[PDB]
Amino acid sequence: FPEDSTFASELELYLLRTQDAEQTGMTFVHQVGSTSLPVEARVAKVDLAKA
Amino acid sequence: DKIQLFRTIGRVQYWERVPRLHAYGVFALPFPMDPDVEWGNWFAGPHPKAFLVSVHPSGPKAGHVYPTDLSDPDSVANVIGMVLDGHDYEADHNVTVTLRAAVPIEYVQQGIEAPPLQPDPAVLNAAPQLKLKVIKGHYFFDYTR
Amino acid sequence: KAFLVSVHPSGPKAGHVYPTDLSDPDSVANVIGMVLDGHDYEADHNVTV
């Protein structure tokens, strides 16, 4: 590793990491003369840590 | 000993709303909330959840709504609709009860000791006398009829 | 021409619709709606009710 310089006496690390919702959920099977059905509820979440 | 490793200091789950049929129509009216009900553990947890409410017909709390007791037949005969997606019960004591919607059966639970995203079998047991009809894994209800 | 269909509430053919038997009270109690016209039944075995 090479070298750096900060002009500060302490260094902190913050890591914001996100687990987004995957684009699963294929498509419902229809027939031409009927009404549709609703799409299920997804989940997304965030998380953040410190060193 | 003066390096502290990574350590989680915050976490948020986010969910979508309870889905419903677009073509079946919407009809909702707000009601006052019952002060004797702990509304904290009904709106707790980020999961999508709907539940049935009964209204008080008479007495000092007439016009207030409480979550439906499935073991009380007078609470069964006074159901007025559902509460969809929850709201902030702290800044407001007036919940919007949905009287006509069409909801999949996974998003409806009555017991607090009932898992989210699963069909509550107590609701499926009492489906006729709660004026619920199960078609294609959905509850159909209109409490104006 | 239109006619009434009834659903099987249970059994091995549950969810399948059949034309309503008016002399059977269980076929009367299980009606789900009408079929308004033909749908080329030979190609597809799923009908819009």
Tokens representing A21 are 């919702």
Q: In angstroms, rounded to a whole number, what is the distance separating the alpha carbons of residues C33 and C4?
A: 6
> Are A43 and B22 an interchain contact pair (Cβ–Cβ within 8 Å)?
no
Outline where chain B has alpha helix (H): 73-76, 121-125
CA distance to partner chain C, nearest, from residue A31 (Å): 7
State this model's resolution in angstroms: 2.8
Tokens representing C33 are 């709606």
Q: Residue A46: which of B69, B138, B28, B11 has the closest Cα?
A: B11
Question: By the CB < 8 Å criterion, does A48 face chain B?
Answer: yes
Burial A18-40 (b: 16+ CB within 10 A, else e): eeeeeeeeeeeeeeeeeeebeee
User: What strands, in cross-sheet order, belong to the sheet with A43-50?
Assistant: A14-19, A43-50, B7-15
Alpha carbon separation from C48 to A31, C16, C34, C45 (Å, rounded): 7, 12, 9, 10
Experimental method: cryo-EM
Question: By the CB < 8 Å criterion, does A33 face chain C?
Answer: yes
Rounded to 5 degrees, what are φ and ψ at B121?
-70, -15
Question: By the CB < 8 Å criterion, does A2 face chain C?
Answer: no
Chain A positions touching C44 (Cβ under 8 A) are 31
- Nearest residue on chain A to C49, alpha-carbon basis: A34
